[PDB]
Amino acid sequence: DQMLIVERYERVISYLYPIAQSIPRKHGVAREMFLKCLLGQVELFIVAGKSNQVSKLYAADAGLAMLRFWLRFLAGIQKPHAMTPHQVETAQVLIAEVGRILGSWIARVN
Amino acid sequence: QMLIVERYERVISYLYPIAQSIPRKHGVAREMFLKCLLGQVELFIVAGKSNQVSKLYAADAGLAMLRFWLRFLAGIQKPHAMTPHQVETAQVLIAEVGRILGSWIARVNRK
Amino acid sequence: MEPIEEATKCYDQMLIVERYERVISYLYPIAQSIPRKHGVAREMFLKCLLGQVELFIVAGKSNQVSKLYAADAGLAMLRFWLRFLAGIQKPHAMTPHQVETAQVLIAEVGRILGSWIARVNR
Amino acid sequence: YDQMLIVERYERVISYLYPIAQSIPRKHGVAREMFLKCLLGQVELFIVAGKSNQVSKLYAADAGLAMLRFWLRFLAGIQKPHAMTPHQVETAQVLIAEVGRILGSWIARVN
Amino acid sequence: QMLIVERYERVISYLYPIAQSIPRKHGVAREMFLKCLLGQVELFIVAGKSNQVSKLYAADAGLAMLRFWLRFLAGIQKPHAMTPHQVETAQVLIAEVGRILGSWIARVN
Amino acid sequence: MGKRHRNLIDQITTWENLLDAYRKTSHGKRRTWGYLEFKEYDLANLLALQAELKAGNYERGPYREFLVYEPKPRLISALEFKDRLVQHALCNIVAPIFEAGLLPYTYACRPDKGTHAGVCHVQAELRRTRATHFLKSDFSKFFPSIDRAALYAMIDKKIHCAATRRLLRVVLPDEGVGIPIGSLTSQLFANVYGGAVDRLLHDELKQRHWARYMDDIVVLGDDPEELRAVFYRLRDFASERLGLKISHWQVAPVSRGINFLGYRIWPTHKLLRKSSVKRAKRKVANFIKHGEDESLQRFLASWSGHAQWADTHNLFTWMEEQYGIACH
RNA sequence: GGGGCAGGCUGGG
RNA sequence: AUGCCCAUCACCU
RNA sequence: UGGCUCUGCCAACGCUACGGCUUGGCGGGCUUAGGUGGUCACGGUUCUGUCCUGCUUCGGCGAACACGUUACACGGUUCGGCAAAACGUCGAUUACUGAAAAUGGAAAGGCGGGGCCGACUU
Questions:
Q1: Would the Cβ of F208 be found within 7 angstroms of any atom in strand G?
Q2: What is the dihedral of CA C13, C19, C24, C30, to 10 degrees?
Q3: Which of C19, F113, F172, F316 is the residue whose CA sits 20 to 30 A from F202?
Q4: CA F163, C1' I77: Å apart?
Q5: Domains, chain D, with CATH or none
Q6: Which residues of chain F are within 8 Å of residue C11 when distances are taken between CB atoms?
Q7: Domain spans in chain F, listed from the N-terminal domain onward
């Protein structure tokens, strides 16, 4: 259900948003795009939950996958390090938690 | 149901002042909150130019996203936090728009 | 000489855009007048104002009524932005006359959009 | 041909207009950002049109060119600072017209 | 998908440094380039999730606009940002992820 | 300006002029297919017009065949924006050098020598000279009788620029007896053409109290047989020289009233012609019994402008008494 | 007989 | 369709 | 345009790969034309009232209420004086120049008033 994923994704955001606000201005486009992928994937979950097409529950998965990309991208983006590898690991754990919930939700719809 | 927009425009009228308040610090969140807040009018508008329930649910998702933005902007920390009062006293406004959207969703669902 | 033909020369899109350019030409100075604070919503208003041209234009060229309704959803959102810039913008953004004036221009574009939606709907 | 030609001719629009659009002041930086997204993002419209040869995709490439011509009009018309001297609109419109010609021929070739 | 993204990761890992050399002047085209560079990951990903070719061609259009961005950053950007060599190598990376995108298009249709 | 004018096609095609021509052509027409198809690539279109005029490759597109009847049928075939723009770009450099030759009394298509400057000129020149009499004439089918040939001897004693001349002749072939009615070029060239009568009134004949508004020519006198003379001389001229037949004429006493310019102009009063009234009366009455009493305020305001000149106080009171609506 | 004005009725619009 | 004055709405000098 | 992929400083939400980043202050740098509508230059027939059948220079103009057809007095539609100049126009796409007026080019003069100068009013 949308409420569960979002509350668990709020933990991703609550971890990553501080991290994504640290991403240097130098990596500012990546940061603002990461932040718009982080805060933003909430909308993907929410849209998936307040409607139903299962395409919206995949678009939420794509957003989580994009968020995972952002983690791997921001980890080792350049010398202005954006996200420390640890932060990617921690965030990937939280994103994996919301990934699991999405997956279960995709499955329960399917 | 265009009382939706005119009841959401009091959500905006409550939330936009405190969305502008979000510092450059929380600037992406602000831009995205403002795009959720001020851009929910478009979600309602599109819902009322179609009376298609998909656009009505997208308006609900936007209100739910706006509720998220409230809960997010609450725990944004520091002197930039949407005060707990404002989260509650905007959730009230959004809930009023939520009630309408609901009734509107129901009006369409039971044609 | 022959005027350069844009393809899909849709009168209604050309007309609406010329008339909406008057909305823009009215509102842009008073979107660009929206203070620093209220810049996210100026930029949002500006993306609604100057980006409604794209909505009309895609409606005319991708002659699809869906994009015409999406242009009406954006003229409606531009009308909201007037409502918002007037009331909810805490300084002022748009004076009541300015809202009064812009609403007239948007209404002209609204008329043309309505006629265009109607002529396509038949 | 077709998509490759249109884009090489539209590259000249971008090569002309990007400096103008990169010159549009931060004040007109929604204009600028939206003009740049119209200018540099018309390549995506051509690209999608090449990918499909759906004439609707080459019509939405014409819509983008029309939007680009709007941006020229608009950026000339903005009188806070200014963005596109009347000459720059004239020169750009010539380039966009050449892109328009190729889009028209491409629309016709598909027709 | 997974492999297209990892090969596009190599595009990003090559191009992102280039996009970040792009002067402030061209920071709106950098912003725009980086939203087609980093934002093409989303195009690939969304095609991986919603496996529609409609989503897959938007990633090819994304790849093709990324190739445009290479052309643009190499020349049209007046301090020709991307060096011609960098366009060549990036088009190698882009055409690897384009060879993958093409194969993926083909596998779907 | 030293006479001559041997290089107007350079000024007609100056970008700064075609932009004026463009803004003049679009003025009001900014809601037409012509402007809106032109506005798209406006300055690239003016660059292919400039360079069509600067070349001489300019050729006037089809007069979009259409007409208005109003039992005075004029074939007022439209012109492409491009063509009305070229005409406006001509009649921005070509018009001032013709409309400067126009004797002051030609109160037609000239800047600020308007319809109303005409009715006022007539009234004025009626008061002064205390005209006891007046000749009013009128050219049969004026525009479809402009020699378009002895026109281009007037358009050619004053152009001298043999490319303006060839642009004038594209916009209006030197081959006809019929200026297309409803062309900026033709209001001018008909003003210019009927300006030949204004020079056979004012120059020859030495009529110093006259007024011409395009094809209508008031000629206040004092001996009404000197104005039947003037008229006979005017008709013989405009027939033999201009191929203008005079449709109606009269040497009415200033007492019948000079039905000039949709007016009726005694030294004393300038009552618009009774047909304007009847139209307006009927227009108002219709508007009332159509429920359209809000576009009637627009029409009223406009008609009050056409009648603020005329001595329409009594009429405005009367229409306010019949329907209540705020005329003035 | 003709004609002008305001209403009848029918088109234009 | 062109002109002609008005009327209004706008917008800065 | 709350911007800077922009710094310096300082501070601390924080995040730190321990370098910083971020972020906050704080400085510096970069950042008159127009629009809409009309306005003047829709009829056809019988009917019901109502009136004219005036005028004419024979072209037409009208009057049946705009009704004192008129705000019956004026616009700047004002009043004189001038008309040198400039403008106009004819002279003239002339003389002249030059093979050619060829996208040179007059003028004297003649004709205007459109112009000028006052008065009074605007």
A1: no
A2: -160
A3: F172
A4: 41
A5: 3-110 (1.20.1440.60)
A6: 33, 36
A7: 9-261, 274-323
